[PDB]
Design a protein around this ligand. Sequence first.
Ligand SMILES: CSc1ccccc1CC(=O)N1C[C@H](C)C[C@H](C(N)=O)C1
Ligand SMILES: [Zn+2]
Length: 139
Amino acid sequence: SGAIYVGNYRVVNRHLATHNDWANLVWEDSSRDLLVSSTTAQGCDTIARCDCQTGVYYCSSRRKHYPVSFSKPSLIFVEASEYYPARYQSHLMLAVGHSEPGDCGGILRCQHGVVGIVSTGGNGLVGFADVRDLLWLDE
Ligand SMILES: CSc1ccccc1CC(=O)N1C[C@H](C)C[C@H](C(N)=O)C1
Ligand SMILES: [Zn+2]
């Protein structure tokens, strides 16, 4: 679990969104596993606007932050679930690191701010849904 709170927005994994998130829906993309909802309170986080490929993510299954090198946002195949069929997920960045079902929502950050959130993983890998192209989150 976990979310990004920036201004009057809450960014979460689409497969983990609540009834309140869907009732206050701003934008959602099943191909990116992202959903953004409106909030009344002001948000605590800064979004990075960069092409960094190094950062630090939070891993709940270990209660630890880990430093990682990660790939550029791209189309990557992902397997079925109670939420999605076999498909390509766009804007996804992979890194060598630990992740298990439960780690989705953990934040990835570089020196410039919030880069994205944990969204996939498996066999010594971890995938992050990028948010750096969502320029509207700032305005
Ligand atoms: C950190 S997630 C993870 C990690 C290790 C092993 C397995 C997983 C689970 C995982 O990759 N997915 C299941 C999730 C319900 C939806 C995800 C998606 N974005 O389509 C894919
Ligand atoms: Zn950066």
